[PDB]
């Protein structure tokens, strides 16, 4: 769960390193295709809540501060219109 | 300093040594001696270890996503 209240700093660093190896060994448009399919959004809603929008802000700034950006542009426009 | 610099790359040319009749004549010199060779070896190891690829014009195609943060 991408929640800054509950997850540890080690958990955030772990998720950052895991997603960095994902973005290295396979492409980022392919990663967005793997991450934006509707079937795994019941399993992505822990990662992508789009609710309690300071956690959405944490997810946006986390996937930007890893070095990616991009993956939370949908969360960025969610934060814009909500 | 601009006049001295004009003299400095007036001096800084190829300027091959002249073939001398007999022994050649020694000329004057240098850099900073006390302590500087330790940092010279430190950044020598740093330059020998650190590496990058692409040309010097390689900062292009950067979207530069900023943090949206809290309003």
């Amino acid at each position: 769960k991408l929640s800054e209240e509950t997850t540890t700093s080690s958990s955030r660093i772990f998720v950052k390193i895991f997603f960095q190896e994902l973005c290295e060994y396979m492409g980022l448009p392919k990663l967005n295709a793997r991450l934006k399919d509707e079937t795994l959004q019941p399993f992505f809603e822990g990662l992508l809540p789009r609710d309690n929008p300071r956690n959405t802000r944490f997810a946006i700034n986390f996937f930007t501060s890893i070095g990616l950006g991009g993956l939370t542009d949908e969360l960025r426009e969610h934060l814009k219109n909500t | 300093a601009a006049g001295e610099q004009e003299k400095l790359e007036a001096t800084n040319r190829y300027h091959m040594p002249k073939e001398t009749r007999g022994q050649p004549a020694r000329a004057v010199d240098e850099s900073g001696a006390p302590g500087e060779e330790q940092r010279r070896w430190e950044e020598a190891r740093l330059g020998a270890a650190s590496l990058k690829f692409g040309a010097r014009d390689a900062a292009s195609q950067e979207p530069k996503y900023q943090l949206v943060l809290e309003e």
Binding site: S9, I13, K16 | -
Partner: peptide, 28 residues
């Protein structure tokens, strides 16, 4: 070495420390 453990965890990548740094850069 739990002191070195938490020192590495505080001098690590630390995304929340990056958010504090960027939020203070934006507020300043």
């Amino acid at each position: 070495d739990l002191d070195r453990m938490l020192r590495e965890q505080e001098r690590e990548g630390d995304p929340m420390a990056n958010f504090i740094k960027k939020n203070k850069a934006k507020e300043n």
